[PDB]
Design a protein around this ligand. Sequence first.
Ligand SMILES: CCCCCCCCCCCCCCCCCC(=O)OC[C@H](COP(=O)([O-])OCC(O)COP(=O)([O-])OC[C@@H](COC(=O)CCCCCCCCCCCCCCCCC)OC(=O)CCCCCCCCCCCCCCCCC)OC(=O)CCCCCCCCCCCCCCCCC
Ligand SMILES: CCCCCCCCCCCCCCCCCC(=O)OC[C@H](COP(=O)([O-])OCC(O)COP(=O)([O-])OC[C@@H](COC(=O)CCCCCCCCCCCCCCCCC)OC(=O)CCCCCCCCCCCCCCCCC)OC(=O)CCCCCCCCCCCCCCCCC
Ligand SMILES: CCCCCCCCCCCCCCCCCC(=O)OC[C@H](COP(=O)([O-])OCC[N+](C)(C)C)OC(=O)CCCCCCCCCCCCCCCCC
Ligand SMILES: CCCCCCCCCCCCCCCCCC(=O)OC[C@H](COP(=O)([O-])OCC[N+](C)(C)C)OC(=O)CCCCCCCCCCCCCCCCC
Ligand SMILES: CCCCCCCCCCCCCCCCCC(=O)OC[C@H](COP(=O)([O-])OCC[N+](C)(C)C)OC(=O)CCCCCCCCCCCCCCCCC
Ligand SMILES: CCCCCCCCCCCCO[C@@H]1O[C@H](CO)[C@@H](O[C@H]2O[C@H](CO)[C@@H](O)[C@H](O)[C@H]2O)[C@H](O)[C@H]1O
Ligand SMILES: CCCCCCCCCCCCO[C@@H]1O[C@H](CO)[C@@H](O[C@H]2O[C@H](CO)[C@@H](O)[C@H](O)[C@H]2O)[C@H](O)[C@H]1O
Ligand SMILES: CCCCCCCCCCCCO[C@@H]1O[C@H](CO)[C@@H](O[C@H]2O[C@H](CO)[C@@H](O)[C@H](O)[C@H]2O)[C@H](O)[C@H]1O
Lengths: 71, 71, 71, 71, 122, 82, 52, 188, 93, 149, 117
Amino acid sequence: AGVASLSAAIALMSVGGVAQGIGSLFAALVSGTARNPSIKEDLFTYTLIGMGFLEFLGIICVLMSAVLLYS
Amino acid sequence: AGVASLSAAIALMSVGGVAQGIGSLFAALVSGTARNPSIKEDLFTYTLIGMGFLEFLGIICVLMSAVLLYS
Amino acid sequence: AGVASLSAAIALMSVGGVAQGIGSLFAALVSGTARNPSIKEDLFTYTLIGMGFLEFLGIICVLMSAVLLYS
Amino acid sequence: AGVASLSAAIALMSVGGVAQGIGSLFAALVSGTARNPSIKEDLFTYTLIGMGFLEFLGIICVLMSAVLLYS
Amino acid sequence: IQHWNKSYEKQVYSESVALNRTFQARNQLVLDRLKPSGAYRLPAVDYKRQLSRGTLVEGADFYLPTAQEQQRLARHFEPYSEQEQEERRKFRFQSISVYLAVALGASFVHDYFYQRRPVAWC
Amino acid sequence: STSPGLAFANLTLLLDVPQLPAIWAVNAWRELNGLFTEMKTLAGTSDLLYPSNRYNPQNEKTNRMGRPRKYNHGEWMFGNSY
Amino acid sequence: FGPTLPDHAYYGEHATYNYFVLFIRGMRPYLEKIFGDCASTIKNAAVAVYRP
Amino acid sequence: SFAIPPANAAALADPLPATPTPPPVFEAVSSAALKNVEEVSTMERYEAAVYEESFKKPIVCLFFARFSLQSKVLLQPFLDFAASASNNATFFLIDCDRVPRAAYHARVENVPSLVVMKGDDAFRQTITDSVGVKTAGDLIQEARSALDQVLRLDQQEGGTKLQPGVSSYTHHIGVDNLNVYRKGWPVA
Amino acid sequence: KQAWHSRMGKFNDRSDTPMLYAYMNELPSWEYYDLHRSAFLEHMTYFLVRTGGDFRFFPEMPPWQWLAHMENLRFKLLSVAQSRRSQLQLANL
Amino acid sequence: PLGVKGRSVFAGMRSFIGQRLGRLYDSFYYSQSSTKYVMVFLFPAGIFYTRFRADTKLGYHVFINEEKLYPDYSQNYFDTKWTNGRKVYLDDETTVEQLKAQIYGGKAAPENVKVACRGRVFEDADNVAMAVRAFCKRDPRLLLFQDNL
Amino acid sequence: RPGQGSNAQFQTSLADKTRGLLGVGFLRPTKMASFAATFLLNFRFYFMYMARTTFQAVRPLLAFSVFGEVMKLVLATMSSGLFSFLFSFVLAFEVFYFFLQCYISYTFLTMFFTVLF
Ligand SMILES: CCCCCCCCCCCCCCCCCC(=O)OC[C@H](COP(=O)([O-])OCC(O)COP(=O)([O-])OC[C@@H](COC(=O)CCCCCCCCCCCCCCCCC)OC(=O)CCCCCCCCCCCCCCCCC)OC(=O)CCCCCCCCCCCCCCCCC
Ligand SMILES: CCCCCCCCCCCCCCCCCC(=O)OC[C@H](COP(=O)([O-])OCC(O)COP(=O)([O-])OC[C@@H](COC(=O)CCCCCCCCCCCCCCCCC)OC(=O)CCCCCCCCCCCCCCCCC)OC(=O)CCCCCCCCCCCCCCCCC
Ligand SMILES: CCCCCCCCCCCCCCCCCC(=O)OC[C@H](COP(=O)([O-])OCC[N+](C)(C)C)OC(=O)CCCCCCCCCCCCCCCCC
Ligand SMILES: CCCCCCCCCCCCCCCCCC(=O)OC[C@H](COP(=O)([O-])OCC[N+](C)(C)C)OC(=O)CCCCCCCCCCCCCCCCC
Ligand SMILES: CCCCCCCCCCCCCCCCCC(=O)OC[C@H](COP(=O)([O-])OCC[N+](C)(C)C)OC(=O)CCCCCCCCCCCCCCCCC
Ligand SMILES: CCCCCCCCCCCCO[C@@H]1O[C@H](CO)[C@@H](O[C@H]2O[C@H](CO)[C@@H](O)[C@H](O)[C@H]2O)[C@H](O)[C@H]1O
Ligand SMILES: CCCCCCCCCCCCO[C@@H]1O[C@H](CO)[C@@H](O[C@H]2O[C@H](CO)[C@@H](O)[C@H](O)[C@H]2O)[C@H](O)[C@H]1O
Ligand SMILES: CCCCCCCCCCCCO[C@@H]1O[C@H](CO)[C@@H](O[C@H]2O[C@H](CO)[C@@H](O)[C@H](O)[C@H]2O)[C@H](O)[C@H]1O
């Protein structure tokens, strides 16, 4: 029951790979608010959509970690 | 077949590059909507096209992973 | 018999890297469209050519992966 | 037993890296065209030359991978 | 090449002729016999055609069934009859007494008729 | 219309409302089998029939568990051995 | 070979004046009769039990 | 995103203006009220008909338009049919451009069109030639058959068996949303 | 009103984010003529000529008789034009 | 004005059912051939068959002890190979001999083959249902083995 | 007659009308199979949506429960006063973090439970 644990630990890399990308998205939100404060909404919607995508990828990798951890 | 579970983990590590790509894309989208907002209808469309590719690639990276986890 | 499987997993990781590159291209195109809207068609065509080449490389990797799963 | 397969997979990862490199080329293309269309043909020629070199290197890598596969 | 693409178009439209003949036969055999009358047609018209006709109305997610209820805001002098007024005066507040009674009854029934479970005896 | 939060209900409906015809058909088949069993019982049987049981193989030469009856070769003054 | 289908075969009905809402608005009187009769029956039974 | 501009002065103008009339020489060609029908000019009259007269005894409505030659050909035999069978039914003459809401009501898509009506949906039979194969006599024969059928069915079963259908609860609101005003429903 | 129109458009329209446009193999009249402008013209000239009529009475779906006649006339025209091209347009070179 | 004199509520029910059926026919006619036949006949039929079979018949998971006892399925299509754990639906009158023949495709089975459930050998002139009821109640996992001993 | 000229062209073969009866180019069983395949493959979206929904629903529960368990471990282990003084601020941070997660979940849930019609 050691290979399952190692497989899950190896699958956990995409979490760190996704945190990069969430960082860039919210950095872009910040820069857009600094360049055009007249548009706060209509930037946060797109930010939340892309963040939702990356959250889905995080859910995928964590789910598969638990899968390989018990199967 | 624990090596199956290892291969799967490796096959999921690719999400780290996928999400990064998606992040960069949406970051550029937000920057565009903060620079030339009146053409969101263009930018969002192009973004959707890009996602239609990236999504597909990620789905492959899942599918084959599961295949190597079963076969 | 999983030694072939690891090779397939590595190929999948390569595919993810290709996906990241595709996302970068899309991001650049969106930024370009925002800066110069009237020239979209030319930029879009150039992006399409790049996308096709990247897609070809990705398909090549997936194919080799399938081959390595059996042979 | 499948060391050659592992080597082929590693070569594939290198190919993915090459694709990522290409992405920057075509991003610069879609940006320099937005910034000066009148010299776009010249920019396209330079981008094509760079792309050809990158493709050549990738082809060389693939040839090496095939040789490795066949010992 | 010219020869070959021309003959390609030729037997393309040959296949088209065949398709048209079978299309005619299918229609006049099967579909003209199985066609609906029109009595049980769809009792509506698409919103685009209504919009072009100048007929579409968008409003009133709700409705008012009775004319007595429709003309209330236009009467201005008797929005409600006197009988209706005194009947409405009985509902100035909600009935916590009735709430309590109904809730206790429903809880009693739900607990001692519908949610009985076994218990050990020593 | 719909939404991501209604995926549970959408899946459940799509997969279960087509099964309701089959469920009703199963119920009707069960009632008919019960009717036929009760008509047979009214007509008469050598050995009894258990109504709410899956299968009733008992007869003159067969037990209530599908095996041959023991001590059933001869005849008995009190009639059937059961 | 052209359109074989009309537009209403594809397009969604009106959002606010739709088939079901018109139908149930038409059936309102019969349902009122039904449920009022049932409620009155139950109430009369309960009152005949509770008064004595 | 779909839109149509609201209207134009041309569209809202009079659809049926007068045109010049010739002298009595152009009329000389090789091929050379009415006391039995009712020309309808108003959706009020059309509704009165459909909701009272069509419940008393059946109606036959001819929907035409001026541009159509088939309407001109079909007019006279329609008047003869009316003179024949006015005892059993009422007969109406409607122009689609003058009264479009009557055409939307009857669900006419081509002109000319005969429409036999009883109870406003208990019997509605539309007769037309969407293809272009029939003739006026064929249309009138079909109309006579439909009128006979609806009369027989009204006599059938003690006057019943012809009750209104979906219009009992729809009020032709999906067909023409402007009936919400007639029903008095809000539009806010 | 604007919400009504936007909702109906998002639901029914052909878009990059389609709700109802899905599993399309036999199209309805409106979408068919919006995608195939060549056929709208042909189906419309035939209607005005076969029946002297106004565009306002344009049928939702045409008859199969009309469609078959159109295909026969297309045969005639393409035959004549193709044979003319075959003779003269290529002896040029 | 609800109701009319001389007319019955049953007549109105018949009217309504006629209306509904006519409308269904109209909507089925004016529909895509690609989708409607599938969605209206083939998915309902398959779902009906599956649900009826599960809710009515009774099935068993079959296993075999050794690979040498596996059947030959090379010729018959869609199953070239035996796999253990196959769900097998049977009738109440089925016997062990009939089950064995069904497994081995009406062909010559090996010698001294017997069926067991939870370690308990079945006679071949036994009803599978009652034998399972006796030996393995609510655990119908059957095993085929060679009884040489 | 008006349409006799066109209806004279419509005369078919026996094989033509058999082919039409069978509906060769108008049933398209390959199209039916493609539709069935696409329709069954589209069931993945329900799984994706339910996964997202459950994650957004349990996010506050996690922030309240598992980080709570961690804080409880630290409380059980710590004894002195300096560390406790410093840990009070961590607890307050956890309060604010919980409210942040609750706000995020509210946003995503109003997005996922909003219906046009
Ligand atoms: C365990 C539950 C079991 C059931 C499952 C639950 C399903 C229902 C869920 C409802 C949830 C709603 C939330 C609660 C509502 C709160 C507010 C409120 O009710 O306002 C006050 C309101 C008072 O009304 P009012 O506006 O002041 O009107 C007073 C008038 O003056 C009175 O004069 P009148 O002229 O109006 O008439 C007099 C009299 C009688 O009426 C008459 O005029 C005479 C005619 C009466 C004769 C017929 C009687 C009715 C039918 C028979 C009933 C009993 C037995 C049935 C036996 C069957 C046949 C034998 O009126 C009534 O009887 C009122 C009818 C009560 C029905 C409930 C209200 C409708 C709500 C819709 C519920 C949805 C259910 C679906 C329906 C079924 C499918 C279609 O309260 C109520 O009357 C309703 C009682 C609520 C039910 C209790 C359920 C418990 C709620 C739990 C909430 C707490 C949550 C957390 C729990 C943990 C705590 C620690
Ligand atoms: C074996 C092979 C199996 C394969 C199938 C084989 C064929 C078998 C028969 C058909 C089976 C498929 C049925 C599918 C129908 C539903 C969806 C559909 O496909 O419709 C498309 C089809 C076309 O849709 P469309 O072209 O887009 O729109 C045109 C309109 O539908 C045009 O409508 P309209 O403008 O002419 O009229 C408006 C229409 C509206 O129809 C609609 O458009 C929407 C219908 C809503 C459906 C969803 C409602 C679910 C609501 C939940 C229920 C909650 C109840 C709460 C109770 C609490 C009380 C305590 O009004 C209705 O007629 C609907 C009545 C049913 C709704 C009942 C709702 C409760 C109110 C109760 C009223 C009182 C009873 C009736 C009184 C009348 C006098 C007797 O729908 C229709 O043609 C008419 C609606 C269908 C009504 C049901 C017809 C009877 C079905 C019988 C099912 C029995 C199956 C069991 C067989 C036995 C096996 C053992
Ligand atoms: C049993 C549990 C039911 C609980 C859930 C349902 C809600 C409970 C309330 C009762 C439900 C039924 C309400 C019916 C309302 C319709 C009344 C009405 O007038 O409709 C117009 C019909 C048609 O009328 P008509 O068109 O012939 O003549 C009148 C014309 N107008 C309306 C213009 C004046 O009226 C009737 O004739 C009676 C219909 C109601 C009786 C049927 C009940 C339907 C429920 C069963 C469904 C299945 C039908 C097949 C049954 C086969 C039996 C073997
Ligand atoms: C607690 C319970 C709460 C839930 C309520 C439970 C009851 C109500 C649940 C209903 C929800 C699901 C309803 C979905 C219905 C889907 C069925 C459907 O529409 O089919 C797809 C087809 C597909 O049509 P389509 O493909 O052209 O268009 C569909 C939609 N688009 C355009 C987006 C693709 O729909 C139809 O047109 C037919 C539907 C009506 C027919 C219904 C089946 C009965 C047919 C009987 C007549 C057979 C005639 C045979 C004659 C042969 C000769 C020609
Ligand atoms: C579209 C719908 C969107 C839905 C969004 C749903 C997301 C929000 C879900 C969070 C629910 C969490 C609340 C329950 C947890 C607390 C349990 C509890 O009360 O303990 C008993 C508390 C604590 O009592 P105590 O700690 O003093 O002693 C008793 C404690 N027990 C019994 C547990 C041992 O009882 C109280 O006295 C409470 C009084 C103060 C008020 C507390 C409410 C504020 C804290 C929770 C707010 C959460 C909502 C934030 C909304 C933000 C949205 C912008
Ligand atoms: C003051 C009078 C007011 C009127 C109240 C009259 C209400 C009468 C309704 C009774 C209906 C209850 O319905 C019944 O509920 C009980 C639970 O308690 C269920 O009981 C079930 O579970 C319990 C506990 O395991 C067991 O007894 C048994 O397995 C089974 O009977 C029944 O399966 C169900 O049929
Ligand atoms: C056309 C025929 C009739 C159509 C109506 C169909 C509706 C029947 C559904 C009622 C619920 C049935 O649910 C259950 O099934 C059958 C009776 O049917 C009974 O089942 C029990 O008695 C029946 C006798 O008929 C036995 O065959 C069965 O072995 C036993 O388990 C249960 O006591 C009942 O709870
Ligand atoms: C319009 C009316 C429709 C009402 C619905 C009526 C149900 C329609 C389906 C009837 C199908 C009958 O088909 C029959 O079903 C039963 C039960 O599966 C099968 O019978 C099988 O199970 C039963 C119960 O143990 C036993 O007879 C035996 O074990 C076995 O033969 C028959 O092999 C099959 O021929």
